[PDB]
Amino acid sequence: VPVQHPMYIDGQFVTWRGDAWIDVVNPATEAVISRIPDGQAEDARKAIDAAERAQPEWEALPAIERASWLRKISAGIRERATEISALIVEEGGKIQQLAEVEVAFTADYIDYMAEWARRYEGEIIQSDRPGENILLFKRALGVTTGILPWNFPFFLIARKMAPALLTGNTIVIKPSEFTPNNAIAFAKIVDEIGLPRGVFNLVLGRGETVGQELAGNPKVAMVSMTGSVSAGEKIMATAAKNITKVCLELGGKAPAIVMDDADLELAVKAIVDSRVINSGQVCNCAERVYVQKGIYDQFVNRLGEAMQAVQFGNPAERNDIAMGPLINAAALERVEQKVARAVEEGARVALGGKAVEGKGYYYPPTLLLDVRQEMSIMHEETFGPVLPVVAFDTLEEAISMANDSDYGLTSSIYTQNLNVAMKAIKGLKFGETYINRENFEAMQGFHAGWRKSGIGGADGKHGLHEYLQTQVVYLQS
Amino acid sequence: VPVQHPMYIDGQFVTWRGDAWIDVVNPATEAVISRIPDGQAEDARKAIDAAERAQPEWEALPAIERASWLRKISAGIRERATEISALIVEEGGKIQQLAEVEVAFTADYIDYMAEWARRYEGEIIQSDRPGENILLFKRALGVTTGILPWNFPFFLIARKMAPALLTGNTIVIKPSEFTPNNAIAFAKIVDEIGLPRGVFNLVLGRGETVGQELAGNPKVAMVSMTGSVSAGEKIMATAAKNITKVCLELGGKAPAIVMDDADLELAVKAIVDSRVINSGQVCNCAERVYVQKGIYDQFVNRLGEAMQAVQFGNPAERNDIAMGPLINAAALERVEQKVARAVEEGARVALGGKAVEGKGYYYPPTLLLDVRQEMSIMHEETFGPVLPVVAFDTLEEAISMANDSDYGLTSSIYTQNLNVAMKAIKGLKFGETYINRENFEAMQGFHAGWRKSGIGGADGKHGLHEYLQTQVVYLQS
Amino acid sequence: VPVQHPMYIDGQFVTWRGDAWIDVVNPATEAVISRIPDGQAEDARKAIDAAERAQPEWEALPAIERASWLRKISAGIRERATEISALIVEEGGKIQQLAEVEVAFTADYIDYMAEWARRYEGEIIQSDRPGENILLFKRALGVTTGILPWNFPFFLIARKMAPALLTGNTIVIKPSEFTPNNAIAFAKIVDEIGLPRGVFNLVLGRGETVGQELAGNPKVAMVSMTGSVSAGEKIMATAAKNITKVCLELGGKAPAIVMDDADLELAVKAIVDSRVINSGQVCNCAERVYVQKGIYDQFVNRLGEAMQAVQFGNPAERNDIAMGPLINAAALERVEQKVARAVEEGARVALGGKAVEGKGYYYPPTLLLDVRQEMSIMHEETFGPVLPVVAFDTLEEAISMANDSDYGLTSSIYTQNLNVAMKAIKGLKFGETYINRENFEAMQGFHAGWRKSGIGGADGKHGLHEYLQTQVVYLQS
Amino acid sequence: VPVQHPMYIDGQFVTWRGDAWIDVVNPATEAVISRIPDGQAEDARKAIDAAERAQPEWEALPAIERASWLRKISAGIRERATEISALIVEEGGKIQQLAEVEVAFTADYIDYMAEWARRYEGEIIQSDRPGENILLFKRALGVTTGILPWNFPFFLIARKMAPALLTGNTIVIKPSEFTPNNAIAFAKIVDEIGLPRGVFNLVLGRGETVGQELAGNPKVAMVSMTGSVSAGEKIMATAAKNITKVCLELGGKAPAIVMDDADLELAVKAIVDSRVINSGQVCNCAERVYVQKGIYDQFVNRLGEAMQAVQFGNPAERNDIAMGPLINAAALERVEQKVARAVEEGARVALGGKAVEGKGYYYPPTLLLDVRQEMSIMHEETFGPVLPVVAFDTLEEAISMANDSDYGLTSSIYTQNLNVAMKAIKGLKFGETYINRENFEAMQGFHAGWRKSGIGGADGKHGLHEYLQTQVVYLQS
Numbered sequence A, B, C, D: 001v002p003v004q005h006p007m008y009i010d011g012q013f014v015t016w017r018g019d020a021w022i023d024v025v026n027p028a029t030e031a032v033i034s035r036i037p038d039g040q041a042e043d044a045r046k047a048i049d050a051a052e053r054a055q056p057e058w059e060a061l062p063a064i065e066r067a068s069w070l071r072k073i074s075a076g077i078r079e080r081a082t083e084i085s086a087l088i089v090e091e092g093g094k095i096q097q098l099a100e101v102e103v104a105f106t107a108d109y110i111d112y113m114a115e116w117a118r119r120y121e122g123e124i125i126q127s128d129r130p131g132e133n134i135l136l137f138k139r140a141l142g143v144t145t146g147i148l149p150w151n152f153p154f155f156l157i158a159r160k161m162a163p164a165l166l167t168g169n170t171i172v173i174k175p176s177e178f179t180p181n182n183a184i185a186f187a188k189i190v191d192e193i194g195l196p197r198g199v200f201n202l203v204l205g206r207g208e209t210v211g212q213e214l215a216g217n218p219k220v221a222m223v224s225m226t227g228s229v230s231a232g233e234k235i236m237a238t239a240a241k242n243i244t245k246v247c248l249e250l251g252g253k254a255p256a257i258v259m260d261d262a263d264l265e266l267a268v269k270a271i272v273d274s275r276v277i278n279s280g281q282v283c284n285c286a287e288r289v290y291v292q293k294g295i296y297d298q299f300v301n302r303l304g305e306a307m308q309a310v311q312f313g314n315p316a317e318r319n320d321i322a323m324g325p326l327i328n329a330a331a332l333e334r335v336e337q338k339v340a341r342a343v344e345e346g347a348r349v350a351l352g353g354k355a356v357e358g359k360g361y362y363y364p365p366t367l368l369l370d371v372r373q374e375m376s377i378m379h380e381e382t383f384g385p386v387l388p389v390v391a392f393d394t395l396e397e398a399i400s401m402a403n404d405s406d407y408g409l410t411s412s413i414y415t416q417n418l419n420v421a422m423k424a425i426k427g428l429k430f431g432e433t434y435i436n437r438e439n440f441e442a443m444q445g446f447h448a449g450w451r452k453s454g455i456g457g458a459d460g461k462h463g464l465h466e467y468l469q470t471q472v473v474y475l476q477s
């Protein structure tokens, strides 16, 4: 019997009284593991209202006390890490080891964010007026909402709530209807440690219903959403009605540039890891490789073996695999279609390229060759273990092609040449550029994508300041 | 014969070939002073494309060289200050002295922004990985657009372009169709000093046409618009289609709090100045006064005389007036209606309250009494010399009422009590709080409004950073 | 039998082989509680050399790993807090409750400093040269030394070592020969948790011997010393020989200004607390009070009762006292002499003013009246529970007199008037100004005294940066 | 007839009444060009007192107004640039072109520093106490003194006074007795533009007399001195008596590392330029070269020709030379001795190595080979056009040897390898590291040397903050 999850509103779990439910299916077995309410905008309003009530008294607390609350939550996470991990594996369909780190990192991330308590600073600005003091304070926005993705559902709860709460905001989070269980568990921890009512709220439902309310409710100061570009378009358009601030993370088509002088083994590992992780279902995954011709042959051959070596299976039954299934049937069909589009445009399927037909949504690691920069596969985000490769002559070309995208979240380049590195740094129009290593953001970095990849960012000091606004005081006395 | 202005695109003035024109009328005499093209989206695209072409080579220039270009423009402004001022007075209908400062301040503002060249810093972040360097660079967004207002048309050209160009962005500006002449003059200066083609572009037309293109063109990194809330809604909604970043300044209903222990003379002057300036046509104008009961009588009487003393006339024919006419007929009718709405709701018209019937759009300073916090006049932005006054008992009430608004740009309070001041600072949910002085932002402050007052901000370091984005480089080597 | 303490050098406790020892006497009972080696410069060199060897590999560790080491130490402190407290009480002669907070705060302070790991930032500066990158890195100084005081011996170990180690420096600490036991205990914890050898070293001895070496050894990057002005003079003079950086905290004569409109009860409590704490043996203690005439009478009377109510005794035998004995006989005699000097100059002894004759070094709370600004008692730091009071007319006078000092560490003022506050803030030439509260620095503040009070500072971000230096890299490639 | 210069004290030039004078001799012709007073400590006190009187009212001025004063001075410099240049050439003995840039850069430097007016920020720190505000203000130190060097006498006036005055400090400057004329000219400009009396003061005399007073006068907040290490030792030791803050720039032995993969032509030019500039009389001059063996031969040969091509002469009579004479006879003899010491230790004199015997103090460019790392010539600063070269095997060795010095101001390395660069950056313990370019600091960088090279620094934001201190306000209200 799959559990029927309640939403968490105003400091308590509230059982759903509606008739409609959303089935949460295991992407590996297609079994229904649980059901969440097919929430309505009304449910989002209640949470938003509770969030609004709590905000004043929450921001009035000294920052160190808000931090203290965050630490109780992280400690709560660690005590149930294995259990949380298992939930991620089940509904997310990600490999055990990855679920384990997500959970562990989430707790550390929260603890790290809590350390900002006594550190985000306001400023005292010199005035041209004698006897005047210009004090610029950093204040909370108020009520914030978070629309989470399914690829890293647990971490993203923290990615948004930790910085939000620390700075004195309250939040109403909507997890992805595909992966709500880990969120329910996060709520249980929040409830158990007694976090003040209304500071953290979890509503459940679809994006067109619950999500939209979290972006269109006039009481919301900022809606932080992570999802598809089109979804971000719908979210920002809605947030526009009330001039609501948006913080968007909409994916990418992260290019990887391999120079002739690249540490070939290093590059192949970084790229494969960066591409095969979570079955390529990450916004900063290496989605397109540019290999300089001089090294194309040996590199593509090495890259080919590596990927062909990537094993995939049911994460709950194997800990020797690198990939689990894709999130759902639609996702699988989406990947198959894009690969077909690639073939149709003239691309060559080295290995893989055919979705497994059977229980679950598995897609084999895929290497696409004879790809031309103009091919859709090089522009549209795949979100699957598919890797197209294009050869280039000069750095200028690689840079030019890497920049030829509506996405600008992550980029990577492997070289040992100083000038090439500096030129790539300067030329690459991306929010992130990894040099001689895999695409894994640090919690103290700034994961903010250029162009359509998003607006605003997450992590680090700047992620923290996304939840802070200013009050310039002109004191004359 | 009114001059037919050409747009400034890709380093040159381009004569309009369309048949439709927009008349630019003098708000004081209703005479047509000039005509601008009824530009189309196509015209905005050409400018945007030119802006895109120039951007790479513009950002490649050392910051100090971009600054050098800004200084040539400011110097250009000063050489023609009187002429520019006259244009502002004519089309803007603002008093000579105010036009003079706008022009003078604009030049200083540009020079000030240019000084950021060698100062906006990137960051070197500690990494948890041995041998890794985390370099966070500040980069330009690329192509930015600016939709300017008519109240301070000249300054706002600089408010957006100076920080934009300094940081390496290129810009396409659309002035308000009501006040384009000063913008044309700004373009002439830009053209005369030889600013690289495509870095600064001026397109002319309506907001639903030209404005929309500047917000919806996919090549635009960020659209910076200053106008009405509803206009901001339309702009952000459009910018949403391409996940374009928005920087919005949409007005306010700036509350002014007068405590019993306030320097009465100081408060009356600050508020009147802050309210009557530009005929109350400023977003940070004192739009609603809260006077503690103990001082209500003497204060309201003093305030009454002050405002009644405010003279208004045709700015081109008098330099002894404090106000000019409102921007246009619609604006006038809007103010009359809101005052009527006030009366209808129970408000009392002390003095003024009746638009002059005749050539021009003049509205007398107006004091509204017997106002209740729930009255529309206390929520809807007036943008006219109308001043409603509400009495209150405690600070808590004044704060509560001040915060009771969809606008949160500016706020002010007059007191001599430490605790009252600190409590007001902490309690006031505004981007700006003036204490014992008039509402005039410093160029080194941060004019960023809360709630519907806007998104992002202008001026100072933070205004400058609105035009900067980040590139986090994870260097391993 | 008093324990003979060994020094802690290069990761291990080393037994003293010399013949001379320093007796550590209980300031309350005059009993010998322990003995430490009468260390020689040679002993300081060994520690410095070990510190130098370890530095490279210590700074090579990721900051988060150094932080991890700090946290092990703080956790170690907490597990033995009661025991550490008891040692402080015994050798320091401070009241149990104060020893308890010192220990508790020390651990929190260390944990707080460890949180800077991923936060101290370098900077990327814009260059006037095309293709150039200016990278300003923050690096450790190298080997640093710390000469600790006896008033807050335990906390100061952390005040210097935590920020030092986090930033990648190694340190050689010399506790005060009067209070080394708590330091030995800190070393035991460091040793037990396995902190890399040479990173933390504890040498024992006198200042003219061991202390001098820690300031004059050419391998020392910076000597951080907290003590008497004359001692600081000797330390800086020595550090001069090798152009060694100094961070000095040399005490103060913290003035307290009470305005007529001050919350009298609040002021009396703040001042007494700030003065009687640790028997007035703190650099930021209220050492001189300026009371506006209008409130002089009632205030001085209230202040008098409060102080007369302050009980003092043997901290190990009573937890109902506010003060313990002074550090030693010399200290006691110093206070008696200064009070006598006060009387001789014309001062009036309200209450107290006579050192108890007997076992221990107790001095009663003392209130001095009929004091003139020029009296020595108003300039020379007392470091005893003696409180001189001077009446003044205007704020200007209070400010002027407060500033009339070679010390400029801490200052305080009690008022409810905005202007008085702002004028005091602006006029007071001090590193710290408390307004309507007692003089207790926050760990996130910046305890850095002006004038002779010191050079550099402690605590917060700026305290942390005292242990960091810069490396500006001009990269052309 | 050589002019007898007066000192500039308290807003006016004061004629010397003493009997003793110091002859200012032209290093190229040995002719007496002028005479300055053999000032006494008393003269320094008068200036310091005037500086103290003016300080309060100077700091009370809005920062932008202080900046305005700086700009008047820079503009004054430019109007007399040629004349100032000529003076530098005459007394400094530097080539016309270098004197010209010094003057031009000085003016730009001052203008740049003035731009900090509205930019140095204080901070608002979060407190653990409810209702408390922690405001950290940046205040001036008060009275500061500057002991200038003779190598870049004009620039250093600005390097110290510009940041000092902008932040609200007043200053008393002592130029080098060898090069006071340019300082007198700077004073004339200051006097002509009407800078408030006492804000800028110029005293003349020797270091043991006037200099010492500027470091030992108890009214001095900070003494900023640039000179020899031993002089810095005497200055800091003196400043110690009153716990006066010191900012010292004491020279260097800047190492240059040439890797096998270095752009040989680029490296030879950078190093020669960096070494031959001002006849090698600069603290950041390349003073020792480390060439990897693989490229040693071709590099040393190229380097040899380059240096042999460096022409030197009387700067007033030739504009085709790269070097002028050394500052004075003692300097010349010092260089000859050090070269002899090199030869005696086993070094080989490729070319030059023999001071010209005749009118003036000329020393030919000198290349020393067969140098061993332990040779004095590789440790003692030469301050002459002498260049020792050592061969090395690995980067590790070059780094190790570069770090083997009491000086740590500047360092440089030429390579095209990413890892080598990053390793050099990380390994080089210097305040500056130039990569593939000559050693010329940017005004927005931070010229602060490690180890004995100095304490504190100059230029940029951090140079500016050397003249700023903090006042942490704990506001409770």
Ligand SMILES: C[C@H](CCC(=O)O)[C@H]1CC[C@H]2[C@@H]3CC[C@@H]4C[C@H](O)CC[C@]4(C)[C@H]3C[C@H](O)[C@]12C
Binding pocket: A312, A313, A314, A318, A356, A357, A358, A359, A360, A362
């Ligand atoms: C086709 C059935 C499923 C439905 C049926 O009973 O017919 C079986 C037979 C082949 C099976 C696959 C074999 C390769 C993989 C082994 C992994 O360790 C788990 C996932 C995969 C992808 C398996 C998934 C599923 O277990 C399949 C597809």
Ligand SMILES: C[C@H](CCC(=O)O)[C@H]1CC[C@H]2[C@@H]3CC[C@@H]4C[C@H](O)CC[C@]4(C)[C@H]3C[C@H](O)[C@]12C
Binding pocket: B312, B313, B314, B318, B356, B357, B358, B359, B360, B362
């Ligand atoms: C009504 C005519 C205009 C049209 C006509 O010819 O009838 C005149 C008569 C009264 C005039 C007003 C008198 C008061 C004001 C004097 C100011 O110095 C200019 C603006 C005002 C508000 C004038 C505007 C205009 O000049 C009016 C309104």
Ligand SMILES: C[C@H](CCC(=O)O)[C@H]1CC[C@H]2[C@@H]3CC[C@@H]4C[C@H](O)CC[C@]4(C)[C@H]3C[C@H](O)[C@]12C
Binding pocket: B095, B097, B098, B101, B273, B277, B311, B319, B320, B321, B322, B323
């Ligand atoms: C109306 C008189 C002027 C005419 C007269 O002499 O009566 C006064 C009253 C209020 C004055 C304004 C106050 C705010 C501004 C102060 C600026 O530093 C200069 C421009 C402004 C905009 C002033 C312009 C002018 O000085 C006004 C409008």
Ligand SMILES: C[C@H](CCC(=O)O)[C@H]1CC[C@H]2[C@@H]3CC[C@@H]4C[C@H](O)CC[C@]4(C)[C@H]3C[C@H](O)[C@]12C
Binding pocket: C312, C313, C314, C318, C356, C357, C358, C359, C360, C362
């Ligand atoms: C004088 C003897 C000590 C020596 C002797 O045996 O004569 C006794 C008698 C009076 C004693 C004091 C009484 C007042 C205090 C009581 C406190 O709870 C502990 C400290 C004090 C200050 C005591 C210290 C010491 O215990 C004294 C001074």
Ligand SMILES: C[C@H](CCC(=O)O)[C@H]1CC[C@H]2[C@@H]3CC[C@@H]4C[C@H](O)CC[C@]4(C)[C@H]3C[C@H](O)[C@]12C
Binding pocket: D312, D313, D314, D318, D356, D357, D358, D359, D360, D362
């Ligand atoms: C030796 C006399 C000077 C004294 C005398 O009359 O004997 C002359 C003869 C050789 C002369 C030198 C020749 C080479 C250089 C030519 C430069 O353009 C100026 C500096 C030098 C270094 C000259 C300096 C001086 O002019 C010298 C040394």
